[PDB]
Design an enzyme around this catalytic site. Structure first.
Site, short mmCIF file in Angstrom:
data_model
loop_
_atom_site.label_atom_id
_atom_site.label_comp_id
_atom_site.label_asym_id
_atom_site.label_seq_id
_atom_site.Cartn_x
_atom_site.Cartn_y
_atom_site.Cartn_z
CB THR A 82 -0.72 0.20 1.01
OG1 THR A 82 0.28 -0.07 2.24
CG2 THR A 82 -1.77 -1.50 1.65
CG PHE A 104 -0.92 9.00 -5.31
CD1 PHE A 104 -1.06 9.70 -4.06
NE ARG A 147 -6.11 -1.62 -1.51
CZ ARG A 147 -6.04 -1.85 0.14
NH1 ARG A 147 -6.27 -2.92 0.14
NH2 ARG A 147 -6.52 -0.79 0.81
CD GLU A 153 6.87 -11.44 -15.83
OE1 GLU A 153 8.22 -11.58 -15.36
OE2 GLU A 153 6.65 -11.36 -16.76
CB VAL A 205 7.78 -10.01 -8.94
CG1 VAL A 205 9.72 -11.03 -8.48
CG2 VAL A 205 8.03 -8.69 -10.52
CG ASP A 239 11.11 5.92 -4.23
OD1 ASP A 239 10.19 4.90 -4.50
OD2 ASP A 239 11.39 6.25 -3.36
CE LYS A 280 10.49 2.91 -1.26
NZ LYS A 280 9.82 4.42 -0.57
CG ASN A 307 10.92 1.22 -4.64
OD1 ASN A 307 10.47 1.41 -2.93
ND2 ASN A 307 10.41 2.29 -4.83
CG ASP A 334 5.82 2.86 -7.53
OD1 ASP A 334 7.24 3.61 -7.56
OD2 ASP A 334 5.26 1.84 -7.14
CB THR A 389 12.57 7.49 0.17
OG1 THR A 389 11.87 6.94 -0.08
CG2 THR A 389 12.28 6.21 2.25
#
Ligand code: 9NT
Lengths: 13, 350
Positions: free
Chosen positions: B51, B54, B56, B121, B123, B166, B168, B171, B184, B201
């Site tokens: 989540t 904006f 999920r 896809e 994962v 982003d 991290k 992700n 993402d 972040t």
């Protein structure tokens, strides 16, 4: 001490 | 020198081949970039996998084929701020145009009165984040295997003038062969030189972002330093309970390392976590090769990583299609579609 859970990205700080 | 004649020649030829690959990759990207496919009732919704701001990401099953996918759902009415909107259009356009072994593959995108949808896809191996938190920290060979994939992915993205913004463990998904899939692309952007949005972040932000300076793709190389540190330590280098405290540590130009870090690792990290942009690896005249040729990566067969020939540190357990055992649980909230179109003009291009 710091954040250990999932971290939210911020679109506009 | 450090290399003998044969080693040096092999490396140079390797560098001409990189150039050749990237030139073909740019041709292919541009075709899809200039010319960017399903419906909601085509899928059964199974479980929320994560989540965010904006909405999920849900595991879904395609009804006709039975294939499983990850569906990112964005509530158009939560995507309200100007840079939230632009970022959503960036994400879709970039994902539909890229192609690389460590980037998640977008299969469908569509919108309705209430939401935007991106179907990727699935994962199943879970986020690097939860494997890392569960084990504590990765060994340096383990961290290096994952880092090599990010280096190659950023070399690819940056060659297309894409900044990722982003990086991290949240992700980075682990696939069935134990390799990474970056998901993402909500902060990714095509940038020819500088850009100015304050986003990302906190723990992973380069100092120039925090300082409201126009910045470039070198912020991704700073973030790689943060990622490698966190993988090898179990916590990131700038670590505090509140974002403002994190920002103060980042700008300071101080980093401390665990006593178990190798000196090669510390040297690499001091050159990535470099506040001076004229000195930061990835940002110098030799570009990504200062990273790829660093001693900490001496055992890395870059081509073999790309070709997925290297044995992975571990293979996630998988019980069959649609297994969600490697993901954490989240509160489920029903997807409601309004009878009235919302925010139609802000999302025309999607
Ligand atoms: O993107 C997320 C959550 N956020 C980071 N989760 C996710 C989980 C499984 C997936 C996927 C995404 O894309 C393909 O498979």
């Amino acid at each position: 001490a710091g954040r250990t859970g999932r971290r939210q990205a911020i679109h506009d700080i | 020198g450090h290399m003998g004649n044969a080693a040096a020649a092999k490396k140079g030829s390797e560098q001409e081949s990189v150039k050749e690959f990237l030139a073909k990759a740019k041709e292919e990207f541009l075709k899809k970039w200039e010319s960017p496919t399903a419906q909601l009732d085509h899928f059964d919704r199974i479980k929320t996998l994560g989540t965010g701001s904006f909405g999920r990401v849900m595991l879904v099953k395609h009804k006709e084929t039975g294939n499983h996918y990850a569906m990112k759902i964005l509530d158009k009415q939560k995507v309200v701020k100007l840079k939230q909107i632009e970022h959503t259009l960036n994400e879709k356009r970039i994902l539909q145009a890229v192609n690389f072994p460590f980037l998640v593959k977008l299969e469908f995108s569509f919108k309705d009165n209430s939401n935007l949808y991106m179907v990727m896809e699935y994962v199943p191996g879970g986020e690097m984040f939860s494997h890392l938190r569960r084990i504590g920290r990765f060994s340096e060979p383990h961290a290096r295997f994952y880092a090599a994939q990010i280096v190659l992915t950023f070399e690819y993205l940056h060659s297309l003038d894409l900044i990722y913004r982003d990086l991290k463990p949240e992700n980075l998904l682990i696939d069935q062969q134990g390799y990474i899939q970056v998901t993402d692309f909500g902060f990714a952007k095509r940038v020819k030189g500088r850009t100015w949005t304050l986003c990302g972040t906190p723990e992973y932000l380069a100092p120039e972002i925090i300082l409201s300076k126009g910045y470039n793709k070198a912020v991704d190389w700073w973030a790689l330093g943060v990622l490698i540190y966190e993988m090898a330590a179990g916590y990131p280098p700038f670590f505090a309970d509140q974002p403002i405290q994190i920002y103060e540590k980042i700008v300071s130009g101080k980093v401390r390392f665990p006593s178990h870090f190798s000196s090669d690792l510390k040297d690499l990290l001091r050159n990535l976590l470099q506040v001076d942009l004229t000195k930061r690896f990835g940002n110098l005249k030799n570009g990504v090769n200062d990273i790829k040729n660093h001693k900490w990566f001496a055992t890395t067969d870059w081509i073999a990583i790309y070709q997925r020939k290297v044995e992975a540190p571990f293979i996630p357990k998988f019980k069959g299609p649609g297994d969600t055992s490697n993901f954490d649980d989240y509160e489920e909230e029903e997807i409601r579609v309004s009878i009235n179109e919302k925010c139609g003009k802000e999302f025309t291009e999607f």
